[PDB]
Amino acid sequence: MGPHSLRYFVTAVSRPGLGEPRFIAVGYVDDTQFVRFDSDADNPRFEPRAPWMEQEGPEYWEEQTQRAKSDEQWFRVSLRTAQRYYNQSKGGSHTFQRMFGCDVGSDWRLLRGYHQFAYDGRDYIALNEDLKTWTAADTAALITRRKWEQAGDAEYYRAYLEGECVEWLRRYLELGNETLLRTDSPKAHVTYHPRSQVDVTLRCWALGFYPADITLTWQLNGEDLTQDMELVETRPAGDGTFQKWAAVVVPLGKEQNYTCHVHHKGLPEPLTLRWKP
Amino acid sequence: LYLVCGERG
Amino acid sequence: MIQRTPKIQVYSRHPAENGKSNFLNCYVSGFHPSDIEVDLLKNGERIEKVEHSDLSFSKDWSFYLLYYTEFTPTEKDEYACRVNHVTLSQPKIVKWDRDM
């Protein structure tokens, strides 16, 4: 139902001295993580991180594991390589990241495909949205960019982002359908917190919802007032569901005038909430 | 499905 | 290079009731590089068997982790999350406040 994403976040962090680089691959579908590879692991393999993946057979794991190993090596080289291009000391730790995968719409039309890299916290080179041309962040990345045009890799990542990524996202949402296609409506309520003779804080809580997308508004007598409102970032509960709140400071004794409004995919219409002595 | 990197940096 | 400092939230999985079993979370996001020390404290002492999720990152390359433990909140027991990171000169303590 609606748009979906299959995303992989890969991180390689070099340790000159201290042993080989650390390399981590973690996979998500939408807001939900489903797989991991981690190089520091006693027995380093590609693993499930969502019970429904234990459905997929042993050659998948073995094949994913192996594919994850080539990249550990690729990232080993690409780090020494990058260390030279930037003319850095041999004894500094540094970070390569890579994100890739596909966003499709409800009709499985590829909305956008990704294959992008960062180095030490900044964009390094990215495959553009056309899936044919590359964007380099700086002249160092020009060196890399030229190899990849020359080797023609754009077409190898494109066919994947237009093909496998998408046909496999379809398959994973099939496997974990009773989690990934679910909706958990927010459990929501309004708390009152005195402060001074002049103010009190009202806080509007949305708990235990899925997917992560939510919008909490505060209104005064039926008019909007999002200006003058504290709100925390959406945060994970730890059980696969999310939490968010929005608070407003209001004058003592005017509490009943305010309405928090909660909007989620799970709710048949928005919730209006009002604090009640 | 994990797609490996082709040519190196 | 661009380093980014951690953004921290401390909170319970469920709304707190004294004596009722729960989970304490410290969500640490918006930081780069990935290396980071996080600890849950109970009256200032480190709690054992703290767990964290797999190291991951957001559209802007910044990392995030959730640390968590089983706990039973209590009237007098102070809980806090203590984070250190290359971009800080001293660790940050954020105390858990059941109302946030």
mmCIF file of C-alpha atoms in Angstrom:
data_model
loop_
_atom_site.group_PDB
_atom_site.id
_atom_site.type_symbol
_atom_site.label_atom_id
_atom_site.label_comp_id
_atom_site.label_asym_id
_atom_site.label_seq_id
_atom_site.Cartn_x
_atom_site.Cartn_y
_atom_site.Cartn_z
ATOM 1 C CA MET A 1 0.000 0.000 0.000
ATOM 2 C CA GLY A 2 1.339 3.438 -1.035
ATOM 3 C CA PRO A 3 5.023 4.239 -1.581
ATOM 4 C CA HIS A 4 7.708 1.821 -0.368
ATOM 5 C CA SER A 5 11.447 1.784 0.007
ATOM 6 C CA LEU A 6 14.224 -0.723 0.131
ATOM 7 C CA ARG A 7 17.365 0.911 1.500
ATOM 8 C CA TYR A 8 20.878 -0.258 2.535
ATOM 9 C CA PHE A 9 23.202 1.778 4.767
ATOM 10 C CA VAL A 10 26.815 0.691 4.611
ATOM 11 C CA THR A 11 29.527 2.145 6.776
ATOM 12 C CA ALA A 12 33.244 1.395 6.671
ATOM 13 C CA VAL A 13 35.559 2.992 9.274
ATOM 14 C CA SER A 14 39.309 2.569 8.950
ATOM 15 C CA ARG A 15 41.545 1.708 11.843
ATOM 16 C CA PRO A 16 45.198 2.195 10.781
ATOM 17 C CA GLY A 17 46.970 0.435 13.616
ATOM 18 C CA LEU A 18 44.229 -1.410 15.549
ATOM 19 C CA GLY A 19 43.327 -3.943 12.741
ATOM 20 C CA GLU A 20 41.411 -3.999 9.393
ATOM 21 C CA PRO A 21 38.591 -1.511 8.806
ATOM 22 C CA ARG A 22 35.222 -2.049 10.476
ATOM 23 C CA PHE A 23 32.464 -2.585 7.944
ATOM 24 C CA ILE A 24 28.724 -2.639 8.637
ATOM 25 C CA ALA A 25 25.759 -3.258 6.353
ATOM 26 C CA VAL A 26 22.207 -2.804 7.626
ATOM 27 C CA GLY A 27 19.046 -3.118 5.523
ATOM 28 C CA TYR A 28 15.627 -1.513 5.894
ATOM 29 C CA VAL A 29 12.249 -1.764 4.197
ATOM 30 C CA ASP A 30 10.433 1.536 4.839
ATOM 31 C CA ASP A 31 10.921 2.470 8.552
ATOM 32 C CA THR A 32 11.693 -1.159 9.551
ATOM 33 C CA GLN A 33 15.147 -2.765 9.609
ATOM 34 C CA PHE A 34 15.264 -6.318 8.319
ATOM 35 C CA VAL A 35 18.930 -7.468 7.838
ATOM 36 C CA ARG A 36 22.510 -6.940 9.069
ATOM 37 C CA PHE A 37 26.135 -7.715 8.278
ATOM 38 C CA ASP A 38 28.815 -6.725 10.833
ATOM 39 C CA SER A 39 32.576 -7.372 10.479
ATOM 40 C CA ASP A 40 33.444 -7.190 14.197
ATOM 41 C CA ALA A 41 31.076 -10.160 14.837
ATOM 42 C CA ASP A 42 32.778 -13.267 16.259
ATOM 43 C CA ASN A 43 31.193 -15.241 13.422
ATOM 44 C CA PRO A 44 30.844 -12.480 10.799
ATOM 45 C CA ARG A 45 27.766 -13.115 8.570
ATOM 46 C CA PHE A 46 24.670 -11.505 6.976
ATOM 47 C CA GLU A 47 21.809 -11.797 9.490
ATOM 48 C CA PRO A 48 18.044 -11.258 9.977
ATOM 49 C CA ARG A 49 16.944 -8.361 12.175
ATOM 50 C CA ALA A 50 13.207 -8.940 11.765
ATOM 51 C CA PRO A 51 11.717 -12.417 12.618
ATOM 52 C CA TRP A 52 9.834 -12.626 9.315
ATOM 53 C CA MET A 53 13.184 -12.814 7.417
ATOM 54 C CA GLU A 54 13.894 -16.212 9.023
ATOM 55 C CA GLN A 55 11.493 -17.365 6.284
ATOM 56 C CA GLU A 56 14.139 -16.834 3.592
ATOM 57 C CA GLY A 57 16.351 -19.879 2.970
ATOM 58 C CA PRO A 58 20.036 -20.627 3.722
ATOM 59 C CA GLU A 59 21.525 -19.917 0.262
ATOM 60 C CA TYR A 60 20.047 -16.427 0.352
ATOM 61 C CA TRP A 61 21.968 -15.802 3.598
ATOM 62 C CA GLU A 62 25.054 -17.460 2.223
ATOM 63 C CA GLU A 63 24.819 -15.534 -1.065
ATOM 64 C CA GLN A 64 24.108 -12.228 0.747
ATOM 65 C CA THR A 65 26.966 -12.943 3.113
ATOM 66 C CA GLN A 66 29.386 -13.428 0.240
ATOM 67 C CA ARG A 67 28.256 -10.286 -1.595
ATOM 68 C CA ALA A 68 28.757 -8.400 1.711
ATOM 69 C CA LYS A 69 32.354 -9.694 1.856
ATOM 70 C CA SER A 70 33.472 -8.386 -1.574
ATOM 71 C CA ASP A 71 32.364 -4.961 -0.428
ATOM 72 C CA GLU A 72 34.360 -5.139 2.782
ATOM 73 C CA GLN A 73 37.352 -5.522 0.443
ATOM 74 C CA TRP A 74 36.151 -2.868 -1.997
ATOM 75 C CA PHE A 75 35.824 -0.508 0.998
ATOM 76 C CA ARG A 76 39.302 -1.521 2.248
ATOM 77 C CA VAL A 77 40.829 -0.425 -1.105
ATOM 78 C CA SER A 78 38.564 2.537 -1.696
ATOM 79 C CA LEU A 79 39.678 3.889 1.717
ATOM 80 C CA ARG A 80 43.426 3.639 1.067
ATOM 81 C CA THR A 81 42.703 5.095 -2.376
ATOM 82 C CA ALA A 82 40.776 8.075 -0.881
ATOM 83 C CA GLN A 83 43.434 8.569 1.731
ATOM 84 C CA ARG A 84 45.948 9.274 -1.110
ATOM 85 C CA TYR A 85 43.668 11.510 -3.192
ATOM 86 C CA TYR A 86 43.199 13.853 -0.234
ATOM 87 C CA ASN A 87 46.915 13.546 0.667
ATOM 88 C CA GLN A 88 46.145 12.510 4.241
ATOM 89 C CA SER A 89 48.340 11.006 6.953
ATOM 90 C CA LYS A 90 48.379 7.184 6.968
ATOM 91 C CA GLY A 91 47.526 7.118 10.724
ATOM 92 C CA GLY A 92 44.092 8.869 10.698
ATOM 93 C CA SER A 93 40.786 6.964 11.006
ATOM 94 C CA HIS A 94 38.271 7.894 8.219
ATOM 95 C CA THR A 95 34.787 7.020 7.140
ATOM 96 C CA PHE A 96 33.267 5.898 3.887
ATOM 97 C CA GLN A 97 29.527 5.458 3.747
ATOM 98 C CA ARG A 98 27.341 4.191 0.971
ATOM 99 C CA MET A 99 23.607 4.224 0.652
ATOM 100 C CA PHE A 100 21.637 2.569 -2.088
ATOM 101 C CA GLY A 101 18.277 1.149 -3.079
ATOM 102 C CA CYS A 102 14.877 2.067 -4.464
ATOM 103 C CA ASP A 103 11.757 4.071 -3.727
ATOM 104 C CA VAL A 104 8.723 2.876 -5.683
ATOM 105 C CA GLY A 105 5.191 4.334 -5.704
ATOM 106 C CA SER A 106 2.027 2.347 -4.992
ATOM 107 C CA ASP A 107 1.989 1.077 -8.618
ATOM 108 C CA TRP A 108 5.589 -0.085 -8.282
ATOM 109 C CA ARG A 109 6.769 2.789 -10.568
ATOM 110 C CA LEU A 110 10.341 3.587 -9.484
ATOM 111 C CA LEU A 111 10.021 7.049 -7.931
ATOM 112 C CA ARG A 112 13.822 7.386 -7.527
ATOM 113 C CA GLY A 113 16.847 5.030 -7.267
ATOM 114 C CA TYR A 114 20.028 5.665 -5.220
ATOM 115 C CA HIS A 115 23.693 4.745 -5.210
ATOM 116 C CA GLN A 116 25.648 7.399 -3.303
ATOM 117 C CA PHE A 117 28.764 7.696 -1.172
ATOM 118 C CA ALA A 118 30.091 9.907 1.554
ATOM 119 C CA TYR A 119 33.640 10.355 2.900
ATOM 120 C CA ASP A 120 34.328 11.766 6.332
ATOM 121 C CA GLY A 121 30.775 13.225 6.605
ATOM 122 C CA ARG A 122 30.428 14.815 3.175
ATOM 123 C CA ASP A 123 29.098 13.770 -0.212
ATOM 124 C CA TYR A 124 31.816 12.237 -2.261
ATOM 125 C CA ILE A 125 30.135 10.973 -5.424
ATOM 126 C CA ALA A 126 26.577 10.082 -6.229
ATOM 127 C CA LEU A 127 24.835 8.383 -9.079
ATOM 128 C CA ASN A 128 22.350 11.032 -10.291
ATOM 129 C CA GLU A 129 18.603 10.535 -10.445
ATOM 130 C CA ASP A 130 18.822 9.931 -14.241
ATOM 131 C CA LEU A 131 20.652 6.688 -13.285
ATOM 132 C CA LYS A 132 23.224 7.442 -16.041
ATOM 133 C CA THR A 133 25.454 10.305 -14.910
ATOM 134 C CA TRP A 134 27.485 10.776 -11.783
ATOM 135 C CA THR A 135 27.929 13.713 -9.539
ATOM 136 C CA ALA A 136 31.234 14.286 -7.808
ATOM 137 C CA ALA A 137 31.481 16.576 -4.727
ATOM 138 C CA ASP A 138 35.012 17.692 -5.359
ATOM 139 C CA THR A 139 37.974 17.172 -7.641
ATOM 140 C CA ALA A 140 39.130 14.082 -5.678
ATOM 141 C CA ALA A 141 35.841 12.511 -6.539
ATOM 142 C CA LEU A 142 36.550 13.422 -10.205
ATOM 143 C CA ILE A 143 39.223 10.731 -10.285
ATOM 144 C CA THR A 144 36.746 8.106 -9.090
ATOM 145 C CA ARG A 145 33.997 9.499 -11.374
ATOM 146 C CA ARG A 146 36.200 9.045 -14.463
ATOM 147 C CA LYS A 147 36.952 5.374 -13.607
ATOM 148 C CA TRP A 148 33.248 4.608 -13.263
ATOM 149 C CA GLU A 149 32.167 6.268 -16.502
ATOM 150 C CA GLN A 150 35.092 4.489 -18.218
ATOM 151 C CA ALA A 151 34.010 1.112 -16.717
ATOM 152 C CA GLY A 152 30.341 1.974 -17.463
ATOM 153 C CA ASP A 153 29.033 1.071 -13.983
ATOM 154 C CA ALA A 154 26.001 3.444 -14.233
ATOM 155 C CA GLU A 155 24.257 0.892 -16.374
ATOM 156 C CA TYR A 156 25.105 -1.915 -13.892
ATOM 157 C CA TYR A 157 23.528 0.026 -10.946
ATOM 158 C CA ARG A 158 20.568 1.267 -13.111
ATOM 159 C CA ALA A 159 19.404 -2.153 -14.284
ATOM 160 C CA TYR A 160 19.617 -3.198 -10.640
ATOM 161 C CA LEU A 161 17.643 -0.164 -9.312
ATOM 162 C CA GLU A 162 15.039 -0.557 -12.102
ATOM 163 C CA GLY A 163 14.970 -4.378 -11.785
ATOM 164 C CA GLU A 164 16.190 -6.474 -8.851
ATOM 165 C CA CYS A 165 15.902 -3.819 -6.073
ATOM 166 C CA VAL A 166 12.247 -3.278 -7.053
ATOM 167 C CA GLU A 167 11.296 -6.920 -7.767
ATOM 168 C CA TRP A 168 12.970 -7.813 -4.415
ATOM 169 C CA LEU A 169 11.294 -5.014 -2.407
ATOM 170 C CA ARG A 170 7.976 -6.503 -3.695
ATOM 171 C CA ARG A 171 9.153 -9.892 -2.388
ATOM 172 C CA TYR A 172 10.178 -8.667 1.104
ATOM 173 C CA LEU A 173 6.906 -6.776 1.704
ATOM 174 C CA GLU A 174 5.290 -10.095 0.804
ATOM 175 C CA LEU A 175 7.353 -11.957 3.462
ATOM 176 C CA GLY A 176 6.918 -9.496 6.287
ATOM 177 C CA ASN A 177 3.445 -8.402 5.203
ATOM 178 C CA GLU A 178 1.820 -8.614 8.677
ATOM 179 C CA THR A 179 4.326 -6.095 10.057
ATOM 180 C CA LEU A 180 5.348 -3.950 7.056
ATOM 181 C CA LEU A 181 1.854 -3.407 5.614
ATOM 182 C CA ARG A 182 0.192 -2.906 9.018
ATOM 183 C CA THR A 183 -0.826 0.313 10.564
ATOM 184 C CA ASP A 184 -0.648 1.068 14.246
ATOM 185 C CA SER A 185 -2.702 4.092 15.122
ATOM 186 C CA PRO A 186 -1.199 6.483 17.632
ATOM 187 C CA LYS A 187 -2.407 6.191 21.208
ATOM 188 C CA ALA A 188 -2.669 9.941 21.996
ATOM 189 C CA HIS A 189 -3.346 12.218 24.946
ATOM 190 C CA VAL A 190 -2.715 15.631 26.510
ATOM 191 C CA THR A 191 -0.798 16.251 29.710
ATOM 192 C CA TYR A 192 -0.850 19.498 31.850
ATOM 193 C CA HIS A 193 2.359 20.708 33.495
ATOM 194 C CA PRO A 194 2.305 23.755 35.748
ATOM 195 C CA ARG A 195 5.326 26.150 35.745
ATOM 196 C CA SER A 196 4.697 29.663 36.984
ATOM 197 C CA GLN A 197 1.893 31.957 37.938
ATOM 198 C CA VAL A 198 1.718 32.999 34.235
ATOM 199 C CA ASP A 199 2.255 29.807 32.230
ATOM 200 C CA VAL A 200 1.596 26.141 32.099
ATOM 201 C CA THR A 201 2.774 23.613 29.466
ATOM 202 C CA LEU A 202 0.310 21.426 27.618
ATOM 203 C CA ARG A 203 1.849 18.481 25.932
ATOM 204 C CA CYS A 204 0.242 16.412 23.186
ATOM 205 C CA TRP A 205 1.588 12.875 22.961
ATOM 206 C CA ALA A 206 1.334 10.390 20.118
ATOM 207 C CA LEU A 207 2.574 6.946 21.203
ATOM 208 C CA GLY A 208 3.187 3.566 19.668
ATOM 209 C CA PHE A 209 2.418 4.318 16.070
ATOM 210 C CA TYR A 210 3.570 2.944 12.774
ATOM 211 C CA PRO A 211 4.555 4.150 10.228
ATOM 212 C CA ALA A 212 6.797 7.005 11.531
ATOM 213 C CA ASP A 213 5.099 9.787 9.571
ATOM 214 C CA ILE A 214 2.884 11.974 11.803
ATOM 215 C CA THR A 215 1.808 15.567 12.200
ATOM 216 C CA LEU A 216 0.710 17.072 15.498
ATOM 217 C CA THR A 217 -0.861 20.554 15.439
ATOM 218 C CA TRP A 218 -2.013 22.873 18.213
ATOM 219 C CA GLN A 219 -4.935 25.267 17.713
ATOM 220 C CA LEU A 220 -6.251 28.179 19.794
ATOM 221 C CA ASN A 221 -10.036 28.547 19.623
ATOM 222 C CA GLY A 222 -10.174 26.903 16.182
ATOM 223 C CA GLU A 223 -7.349 29.029 14.697
ATOM 224 C CA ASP A 224 -3.863 27.584 14.071
ATOM 225 C CA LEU A 225 -0.819 28.329 16.187
ATOM 226 C CA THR A 226 2.175 26.059 15.304
ATOM 227 C CA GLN A 227 4.439 29.104 15.870
ATOM 228 C CA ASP A 228 5.329 29.028 19.604
ATOM 229 C CA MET A 229 5.377 25.243 19.885
ATOM 230 C CA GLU A 230 8.031 22.802 21.103
ATOM 231 C CA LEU A 231 8.165 19.439 19.398
ATOM 232 C CA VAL A 232 10.637 16.627 19.632
ATOM 233 C CA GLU A 233 11.816 14.588 16.725
ATOM 234 C CA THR A 234 9.932 11.382 16.042
ATOM 235 C CA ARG A 235 11.691 8.737 18.184
ATOM 236 C CA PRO A 236 11.598 4.947 18.229
ATOM 237 C CA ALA A 237 9.827 3.217 21.103
ATOM 238 C CA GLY A 238 12.070 0.147 20.830
ATOM 239 C CA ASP A 239 9.253 -2.197 19.840
ATOM 240 C CA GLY A 240 9.047 -1.204 16.174
ATOM 241 C CA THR A 241 6.732 1.739 16.890
ATOM 242 C CA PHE A 242 7.354 5.474 17.111
ATOM 243 C CA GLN A 243 6.631 8.379 19.497
ATOM 244 C CA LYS A 244 6.410 12.148 19.080
ATOM 245 C CA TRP A 245 5.154 15.051 21.121
ATOM 246 C CA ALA A 246 4.161 18.697 20.694
ATOM 247 C CA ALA A 247 3.904 21.183 23.589
ATOM 248 C CA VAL A 248 2.631 24.680 23.898
ATOM 249 C CA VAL A 249 3.049 27.098 26.825
ATOM 250 C CA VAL A 250 -0.324 28.725 27.561
ATOM 251 C CA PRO A 251 -1.527 31.277 30.151
ATOM 252 C CA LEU A 252 -2.766 29.917 33.506
ATOM 253 C CA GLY A 253 -6.444 29.076 33.361
ATOM 254 C CA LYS A 254 -6.794 29.281 29.528
ATOM 255 C CA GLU A 255 -5.980 25.586 29.088
ATOM 256 C CA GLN A 256 -9.399 24.437 27.864
ATOM 257 C CA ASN A 257 -9.138 26.739 24.863
ATOM 258 C CA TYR A 258 -6.439 24.627 23.188
ATOM 259 C CA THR A 259 -6.785 21.619 20.937
ATOM 260 C CA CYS A 260 -4.110 19.285 19.847
ATOM 261 C CA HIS A 261 -4.764 17.649 16.472
ATOM 262 C CA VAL A 262 -3.257 14.314 15.506
ATOM 263 C CA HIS A 263 -2.834 13.112 11.974
ATOM 264 C CA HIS A 264 -1.729 9.600 11.102
ATOM 265 C CA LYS A 265 -2.360 7.128 8.281
ATOM 266 C CA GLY A 266 -3.914 4.810 10.877
ATOM 267 C CA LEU A 267 -6.606 7.194 12.013
ATOM 268 C CA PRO A 268 -9.796 7.370 9.925
ATOM 269 C CA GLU A 269 -9.767 11.144 10.506
ATOM 270 C CA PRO A 270 -7.640 13.458 12.548
ATOM 271 C CA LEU A 271 -7.896 13.228 16.335
ATOM 272 C CA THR A 272 -8.865 16.374 18.156
ATOM 273 C CA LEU A 273 -7.780 16.354 21.816
ATOM 274 C CA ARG A 274 -8.571 18.756 24.601
ATOM 275 C CA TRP A 275 -7.137 18.709 28.127
ATOM 276 C CA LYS A 276 -9.881 18.191 30.774
ATOM 277 C CA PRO A 277 -9.427 19.148 34.447
ATOM 278 C CA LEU B 1 19.130 -7.958 -2.208
ATOM 279 C CA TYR B 2 22.651 -6.608 -1.671
ATOM 280 C CA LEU B 3 24.292 -5.248 -4.827
ATOM 281 C CA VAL B 4 28.093 -5.173 -4.633
ATOM 282 C CA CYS B 5 30.243 -2.300 -5.882
ATOM 283 C CA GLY B 6 31.944 -2.706 -9.290
ATOM 284 C CA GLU B 7 35.066 -0.554 -9.902
ATOM 285 C CA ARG B 8 36.912 0.869 -6.872
ATOM 286 C CA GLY B 9 37.342 4.484 -5.871
ATOM 287 C CA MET C 1 35.376 16.524 6.565
ATOM 288 C CA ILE C 2 32.201 17.428 8.499
ATOM 289 C CA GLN C 3 31.676 16.310 12.095
ATOM 290 C CA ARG C 4 28.263 16.573 13.641
ATOM 291 C CA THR C 5 27.435 16.507 17.323
ATOM 292 C CA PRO C 6 24.966 14.074 18.906
ATOM 293 C CA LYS C 7 21.349 15.024 19.456
ATOM 294 C CA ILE C 8 19.951 13.050 22.420
ATOM 295 C CA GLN C 9 16.552 12.116 23.747
ATOM 296 C CA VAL C 10 15.986 10.161 26.955
ATOM 297 C CA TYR C 11 12.516 8.654 27.493
ATOM 298 C CA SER C 12 10.527 5.581 28.435
ATOM 299 C CA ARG C 13 8.942 3.127 25.997
ATOM 300 C CA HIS C 14 5.636 3.320 27.886
ATOM 301 C CA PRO C 15 4.224 6.111 30.049
ATOM 302 C CA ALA C 16 5.838 5.808 33.498
ATOM 303 C CA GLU C 17 4.157 4.394 36.593
ATOM 304 C CA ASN C 18 6.152 3.826 39.787
ATOM 305 C CA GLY C 19 6.645 0.067 40.357
ATOM 306 C CA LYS C 20 5.563 -0.921 36.846
ATOM 307 C CA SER C 21 8.153 -2.574 34.566
ATOM 308 C CA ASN C 22 9.105 -0.567 31.448
ATOM 309 C CA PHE C 23 12.004 0.279 29.079
ATOM 310 C CA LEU C 24 14.356 3.244 29.191
ATOM 311 C CA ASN C 25 15.667 4.541 25.955
ATOM 312 C CA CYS C 26 18.375 6.981 24.959
ATOM 313 C CA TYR C 27 18.144 7.813 21.249
ATOM 314 C CA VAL C 28 21.319 9.390 19.908
ATOM 315 C CA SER C 29 21.158 10.911 16.397
ATOM 316 C CA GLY C 30 22.548 13.563 14.080
ATOM 317 C CA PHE C 31 26.221 12.733 14.853
ATOM 318 C CA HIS C 32 29.350 12.133 12.732
ATOM 319 C CA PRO C 33 31.725 10.266 12.998
ATOM 320 C CA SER C 34 30.001 7.045 14.158
ATOM 321 C CA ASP C 35 32.262 6.338 17.086
ATOM 322 C CA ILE C 36 30.407 7.196 20.261
ATOM 323 C CA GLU C 37 30.061 6.222 23.904
ATOM 324 C CA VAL C 38 26.601 6.121 25.412
ATOM 325 C CA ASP C 39 25.641 4.889 28.882
ATOM 326 C CA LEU C 40 22.487 4.650 30.863
ATOM 327 C CA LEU C 41 22.875 5.661 34.516
ATOM 328 C CA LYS C 42 20.836 4.956 37.612
ATOM 329 C CA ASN C 43 21.806 7.448 40.309
ATOM 330 C CA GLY C 44 24.979 8.098 38.383
ATOM 331 C CA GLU C 45 26.187 4.474 38.214
ATOM 332 C CA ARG C 46 26.375 2.722 34.825
ATOM 333 C CA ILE C 47 23.641 0.096 34.234
ATOM 334 C CA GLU C 48 24.747 -3.360 32.925
ATOM 335 C CA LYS C 49 23.128 -5.221 29.994
ATOM 336 C CA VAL C 50 22.326 -2.050 28.131
ATOM 337 C CA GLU C 51 21.679 -2.862 24.452
ATOM 338 C CA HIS C 52 21.745 -0.882 21.235
ATOM 339 C CA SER C 53 20.397 -1.163 17.694
ATOM 340 C CA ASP C 54 22.500 -1.652 14.615
ATOM 341 C CA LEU C 55 24.524 1.441 13.564
ATOM 342 C CA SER C 56 22.587 3.292 10.863
ATOM 343 C CA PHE C 57 22.275 6.655 9.153
ATOM 344 C CA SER C 58 19.917 9.365 7.787
ATOM 345 C CA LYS C 59 19.708 11.166 4.419
ATOM 346 C CA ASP C 60 22.345 13.682 5.458
ATOM 347 C CA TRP C 61 24.850 10.863 6.357
ATOM 348 C CA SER C 62 24.511 11.493 10.144
ATOM 349 C CA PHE C 63 24.367 8.383 12.350
ATOM 350 C CA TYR C 64 21.724 7.190 14.815
ATOM 351 C CA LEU C 65 21.538 4.508 17.541
ATOM 352 C CA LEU C 66 18.958 3.654 20.161
ATOM 353 C CA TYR C 67 20.311 2.405 23.533
ATOM 354 C CA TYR C 68 17.821 0.681 25.793
ATOM 355 C CA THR C 69 17.331 -1.417 28.915
ATOM 356 C CA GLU C 70 14.502 -2.966 30.967
ATOM 357 C CA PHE C 71 13.792 -0.824 34.023
ATOM 358 C CA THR C 72 11.232 -0.136 36.721
ATOM 359 C CA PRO C 73 10.792 3.552 37.248
ATOM 360 C CA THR C 74 10.524 4.749 40.713
ATOM 361 C CA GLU C 75 9.727 7.858 42.668
ATOM 362 C CA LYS C 76 13.246 8.691 43.775
ATOM 363 C CA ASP C 77 15.506 6.922 41.271
ATOM 364 C CA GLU C 78 17.280 9.291 38.930
ATOM 365 C CA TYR C 79 17.955 7.937 35.442
ATOM 366 C CA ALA C 80 20.104 9.578 32.836
ATOM 367 C CA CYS C 81 21.908 8.954 29.517
ATOM 368 C CA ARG C 82 25.588 9.953 29.242
ATOM 369 C CA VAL C 83 27.062 10.512 25.766
ATOM 370 C CA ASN C 84 30.635 11.296 24.611
ATOM 371 C CA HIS C 85 31.892 11.972 21.143
ATOM 372 C CA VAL C 86 34.836 13.524 19.344
ATOM 373 C CA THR C 87 32.831 16.824 18.943
ATOM 374 C CA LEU C 88 32.374 17.226 22.741
ATOM 375 C CA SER C 89 35.082 18.219 25.220
ATOM 376 C CA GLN C 90 33.139 16.619 28.028
ATOM 377 C CA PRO C 91 30.300 14.136 28.099
ATOM 378 C CA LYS C 92 26.674 15.352 28.120
ATOM 379 C CA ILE C 93 24.303 14.004 30.712
ATOM 380 C CA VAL C 94 20.599 14.138 29.875
ATOM 381 C CA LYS C 95 18.428 13.100 32.818
ATOM 382 C CA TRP C 96 15.302 11.096 32.123
ATOM 383 C CA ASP C 97 12.172 13.145 32.773
ATOM 384 C CA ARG C 98 9.010 11.016 32.642
ATOM 385 C CA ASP C 99 7.043 13.978 31.245
ATOM 386 C CA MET C 100 9.203 14.290 28.130
#
